[PDB]
Amino acid sequence: ERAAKCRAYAKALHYKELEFQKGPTPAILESLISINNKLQQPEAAAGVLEYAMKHFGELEIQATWYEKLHEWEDALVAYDKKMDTNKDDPELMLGRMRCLEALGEWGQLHQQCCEKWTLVNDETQAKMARMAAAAAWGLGQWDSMEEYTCMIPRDTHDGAFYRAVLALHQDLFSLAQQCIDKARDLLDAELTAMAGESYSRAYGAMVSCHMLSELEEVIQYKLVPERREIIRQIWWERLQGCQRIVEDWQKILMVRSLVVSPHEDMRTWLKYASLCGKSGRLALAHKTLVLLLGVDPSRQLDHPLPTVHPQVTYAYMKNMWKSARKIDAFQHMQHFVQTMQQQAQHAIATEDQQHKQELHKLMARCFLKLGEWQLNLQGINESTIPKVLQYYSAATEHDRSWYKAWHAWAVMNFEAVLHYKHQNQARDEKKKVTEDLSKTLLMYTVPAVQGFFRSISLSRGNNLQDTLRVLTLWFDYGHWPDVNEALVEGVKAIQIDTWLQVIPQLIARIDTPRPLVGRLIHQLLTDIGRYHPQALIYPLTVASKSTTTARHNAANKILKNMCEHSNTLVQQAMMVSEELIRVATSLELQYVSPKLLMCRDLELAVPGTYDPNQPIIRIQSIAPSLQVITSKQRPRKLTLMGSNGHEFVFLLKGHEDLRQDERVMQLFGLVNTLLANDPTSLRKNLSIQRYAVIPLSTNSGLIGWVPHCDTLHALIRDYREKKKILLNIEHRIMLRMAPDYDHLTLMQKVEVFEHAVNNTAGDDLAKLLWLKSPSSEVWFDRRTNYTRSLAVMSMVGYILGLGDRHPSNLMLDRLSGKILHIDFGDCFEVAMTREKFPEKIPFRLTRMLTNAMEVTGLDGNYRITCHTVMEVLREHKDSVMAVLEAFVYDPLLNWRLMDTNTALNKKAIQIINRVRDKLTGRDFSHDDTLDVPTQVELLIKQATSHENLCQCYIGWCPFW
Ligand SMILES: Nc1ncnc2c1ncn2[C@@H]1O[C@H](COP(=O)(O)OP(=O)(O)O)[C@@H](O)[C@H]1O
Numbered sequence: 001e002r003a004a005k006c007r008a009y010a011k012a013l014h015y016k017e018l019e020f021q022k023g024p025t026p027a028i029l030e031s032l033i034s035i036n037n038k039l040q041q042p043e044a045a046a047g048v049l050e051y052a053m054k055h056f057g058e059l060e061i062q063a064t065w066y067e068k069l070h071e072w073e074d075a076l077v078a079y080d081k082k083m084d085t086n087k088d089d090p091e092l093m094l095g096r097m098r099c100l101e102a103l104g105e106w107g108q109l110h111q112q113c114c115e116k117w118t119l120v121n122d123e124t125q126a127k128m129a130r131m132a133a134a135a136a137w138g139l140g141q142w143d144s145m146e147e148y149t150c151m152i153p154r155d156t157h158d159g160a161f162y163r164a165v166l167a168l169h170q171d172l173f174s175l176a177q178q179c180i181d182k183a184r185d186l187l188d189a190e191l192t193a194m195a196g197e198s199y200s201r202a203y204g205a206m207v208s209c210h211m212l213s214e215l216e217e218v219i220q221y222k223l224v225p226e227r228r229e230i231i232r233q234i235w236w237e238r239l240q241g242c243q244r245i246v247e248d249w250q251k252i253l254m255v256r257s258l259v260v261s262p263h264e265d266m267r268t269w270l271k272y273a274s275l276c277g278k279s280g281r282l283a284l285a286h287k288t289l290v291l292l293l294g295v296d297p298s299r300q301l302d303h304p305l306p307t308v309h310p311q312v313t314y315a316y317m318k319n320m321w322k323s324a325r326k327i328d329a330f331q332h333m334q335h336f337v338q339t340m341q342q343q344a345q346h347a348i349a350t351e352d353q354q355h356k357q358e359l360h361k362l363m364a365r366c367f368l369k370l371g372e373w374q375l376n377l378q379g380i381n382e383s384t385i386p387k388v389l390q391y392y393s394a395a396t397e398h399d400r401s402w403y404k405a406w407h408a409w410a411v412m413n414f415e416a417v418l419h420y421k422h423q424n425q426a427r428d429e430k431k432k433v434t435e436d437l438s439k440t441l442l443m444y445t446v447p448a449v450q451g452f453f454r455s456i457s458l459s460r461g462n463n464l465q466d467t468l469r470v471l472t473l474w475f476d477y478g479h480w481p482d483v484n485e486a487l488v489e490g491v492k493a494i495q496i497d498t499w500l501q502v503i504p505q506l507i508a509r510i511d512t513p514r515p516l517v518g519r520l521i522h523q524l525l526t527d528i529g530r531y532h533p534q535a536l537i538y539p540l541t542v543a544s545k546s547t548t549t550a551r552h553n554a555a556n557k558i559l560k561n562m563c564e565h566s567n568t569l570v571q572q573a574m575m576v577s578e579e580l581i582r583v584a585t586s587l588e589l590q591y592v593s594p595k596l597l598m599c600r601d602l603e604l605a606v607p608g609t610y611d612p613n614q615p616i617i618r619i620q621s622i623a624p625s626l627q628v629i630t631s632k633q634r635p636r637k638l639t640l641m642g643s644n645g646h647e648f649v650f651l652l653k654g655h656e657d658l659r660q661d662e663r664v665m666q667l668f669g670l671v672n673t674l675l676a677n678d679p680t681s682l683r684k685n686l687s688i689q690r691y692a693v694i695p696l697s698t699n700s701g702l703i704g705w706v707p708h709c710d711t712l713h714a715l716i717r718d719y720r721e722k723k724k725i726l727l728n729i730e731h732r733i734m735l736r737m738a739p740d741y742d743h744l745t746l747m748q749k750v751e752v753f754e755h756a757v758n759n760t761a762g763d764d765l766a767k768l769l770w771l772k773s774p775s776s777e778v779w780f781d782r783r784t785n786y787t788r789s790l791a792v793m794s795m796v797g798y799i800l801g802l803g804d805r806h807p808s809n810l811m812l813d814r815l816s817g818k819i820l821h822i823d824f825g826d827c828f829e830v831a832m833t834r835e836k837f838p839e840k841i842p843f844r845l846t847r848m849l850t851n852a853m854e855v856t857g858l859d860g861n862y863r864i865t866c867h868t869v870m871e872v873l874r875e876h877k878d879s880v881m882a883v884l885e886a887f888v889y890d891p892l893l894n895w896r897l898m899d900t901n902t903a904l905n906k907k908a909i910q911i912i913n914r915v916r917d918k919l920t921g922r923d924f925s926h927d928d929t930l931d932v933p934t935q936v937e938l939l940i941k942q943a944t945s946h947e948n949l950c951q952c953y954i955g956w957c958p959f960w
């Protein structure tokens with residue numbers, strides 16, 4: 001019955017949205033935020049309010065708008081302006097207060113309550129009490145609470161609750177016991193009264209039911225003394241676990257405040273204060289901290305800080321940094337660290353070793369901020385370089401383990417190198433020059449290498465960035481002994497696994513002209529041969545049949561070496577990739593390649609299915625028939641049978657260098673991990689459907705066939721033919737109007753373009769996805785999926801510079817809805833830079849895409865998902881840049897940038913800057929460093945502009 005209630009909603013939402021289509025009315029708009037709420041789609045509904053604002057300033061008072069937008073801090077200052085310019089107005093005061101109770105502003109909420117007590121209104125008098133109870137509860141003042149509670153009806157969930165709290169202070173446990181169960185039922189029955197159309201009160205019912213069950217443990221915490229540890233554990237664990245915006249946690253802790261004071265909680269409140277900063281309530285976090293210190297909001301500003309609680313101070317100081325005062329913050333840190341080593345070296349009389357180590361760990365985490373801040377305030381130059389390296393090395397000492405510490409040191413060292421390499425390129429633009437540079441670079445290079453290595457070993461699983469960074473220093477440094485020793489030392493130390501991530505990069509340099517570099521690679525690859533042969537054969541096989549002599553030569557030496565322990569695997573894989581190149585409306589295997597029909601029960605793993613952790617699935621049998629996909633390149637629909645039993649379908653492409661597609665699928669892999677690790681992105685299932693890419697030569701290669709998918713172009717062509725609509729009708733429309741369309745001025749083009757849109761249906765996609773759906777909660781979910789997955793690939797695609805996104809280059813999963821990108825030819829601006837028909841667009845946000853989303857589309861799920869995704873990216877911009885750098889400066893893959901014709905070092909540099917700009921918000925204006933939502937808005941604007949879409953090559957179907 002539960003999953004049966006949402007179906008009626010989903011269906012009515014469809015007609016409700018189809019109604020909005022016919023005419024946007026505040027009547028519908030109301031019934032829309034409601035139904036999107038019962039359907040527990042908070043953001044899609046938030047979108048409906050965004051539209052409600054930008055079209056109807058009619059529910060009026062910009063303070064009521066900020067209040068509905070849960071921007072309480074904005075609505076408060078808007079209500080002051082609305083009260084100081086107006087009068088008393090009983091309504092304006094209620095809001096002025098609701099802001100205060102949301103903000104945890106008990107001081108002002110209690111003052112505003114008492115100092116204004118004429119309140120001739122009885123409803124004003126009734127609401128008043130609910131709030132002034134919580135305000136009094138926060139301020140301690142329990143006499144004020146019971147006064148205001150004795151005004152709250154015992155018929156309300158609120159009235160029944162506040163008694164349970166007053167009983168718990170006055171130690172009336174049986175009273176408190178019953179009041180909870182009665183408040184539960186007054187809330188349970190209230191969740192049926194407004195059964196659907198409520199605020200974040202359905203999600204705040206969780207906040208009240210959470211607190212009530214917590215208040216039943218605060219009950220457990222009064223007479224019979226056994227569970228103090230058990231209760232504090234569940235309190236602590238279901239807090240790191242729990243995730244609820246500031247406001248709720250205030251109240252949640254206020255329940256825990258009835259028993260455990262902040263001074264005993266300590267870690268509990270610091271974790272809370274930590275969130276208040278990270279969310280953006282510094283004024284609140286400060287007060288939390290001032291309380292824990294038992295010392296001033298440092299009103300004595302010139303004075304040093306209290307060392308009494310080392311952790312609290314560190315918190316205060318990092319809050320001070322994220323706050324305004326940050327030369328002041330830095331300063332307090334230099335001194336704090338100095339006070340801390342003294343309080344260690346001296347105060348530690350052996351019998352204190354736990355305190356010693358935690359004091360040493362806090363210090364490390366202090367130094368890492370010190371170096372972080374020094375770089376922030378000063379940048380990288382001859383003065384700060386040895387200072388921060390000082391701070392980091394010092395952090396490396398006090399924690400020994402800890403990824404960040406070693407990582408930071410490595411990067412700083414690696415950027416010490418870059419600083420001078422780039423400073424000497426500056427000099428040579430206008431003998432003892434190279435000698436000092438040699439000593440300069442060898443100075444920072446070696447420790448960087450060392451750092452990256454001990455950083456990697458502390459990262460197992462997630463170390464792609466650092467692993468790649470090792471390879472930059474490695475490959476890039478035509479080897480002077482010192483560097484090579486550290487590299488050899490690391491390779492010995494670090495696990496073999498590490499290197500699997502990085503195999504295509506290693507292979508891209510088998511034929512390294514530098515003598516000392518080559519040797520290690522070859523040796524490393526051969527060890528990666530002894531264990532994990534499989535992750536090597538396919539790529540090594542390809543390399544071994546290379547026109548470039550030194551490649552295939554060196555490639556063979558390793559294959560030879562691998563026969564000494566895995567011969568037939570090399571042998572099988574040798575032949576299987578040989579026959580597949582030969583093969584590259586149907587083809588029977590018995591005519592085309594008999595050796596393949598011959599194959600049974602091989603030990604060769606099904607292309608791109610090998611990974612440790614997972615039982616090897618091997619090619620058991622190759623299906624005798626391959627469909628020939630009719631195209632200009634006639635790809636094949638090869639299909640293999642697995643040693644598990646499952647089938648594995650592939651696309652054998654003939655004249656397409658699949659190596660680029662590979663590094664992209666790699667980049668996507670990374671991006672997927674990043675989104676799986678940001679809480680919100682994981683909360684919303686944000687991902688990119690990827691697929692397997694197994695290059696077979698420079699000509700050919702295999703591609704994983706994503707099941708259940710049709711090109712955007714397919715779904716339309718079917719719908720159009722079903723509904724008797726001419727496939728290219730917008731097209732025929734344009735030419736009938738303007739036979740020379742392609743030659744018109746921008747102004748002239750826009751008209752013709754607009755004409756076509758105004759005389760064709762923009763639903764199609766939207767509409768066929770409705771008919772496709774077997775139900776409507778399936779329909780709704782498939783939409784929610786589609787919307788997100790697309791915004792994901794919009795942002796990522798932009799950073800990649802992913803051009804050429806026409807209706808045959810993206811497709812839709814007909815079972816999840818999630819969108820999927822294929823054909824990664826045009827990467828980086830490339831498509832925009834071209835001579836004939838330059839793409840102005842950043843990513844495809846065509847009309848029928850916009851239209852398949854919820855109405856209120858771009859405001860709702862899409863845009864929100866856009867900054868969430870873009871957010872992640874800008875944070876982890878270094879990892880993203882490691883990958884991208886790793887195939888822009890890649891030797892074999894530079895051929896897709898000298899195509900600006902139809903040395904390269906200079907071009908490659910730009911391409912990479914261009915990406916950094918995109919990840920530091922300098923992608924538009926040179927000088928402004930635009931924040932996420934702005935940049936996102938700017939981009940959505942750019943993707944939507946008729947002036948941009950009309951200029952698109954007609955194939956791109958800028959009207960689909
Ligand atoms: N990974 C994939 N999964 C499913 N189908 C695919 C995949 N890659 C390509 N196709 C199909 O092959 C067709 C033509 O190949 P495509 O990749 O578009 O090459 P090109 O860009 O050279 O035409 C596509 O329109 C699509 O139907």
Ligand SMILES: [Mg+2]
Pocket residue numbers: 808809823
């Ligand atoms: Mg294509």
Ligand SMILES: [Mg+2]
Pocket residue numbers: 804823824825826
């Ligand atoms: Mg292409």
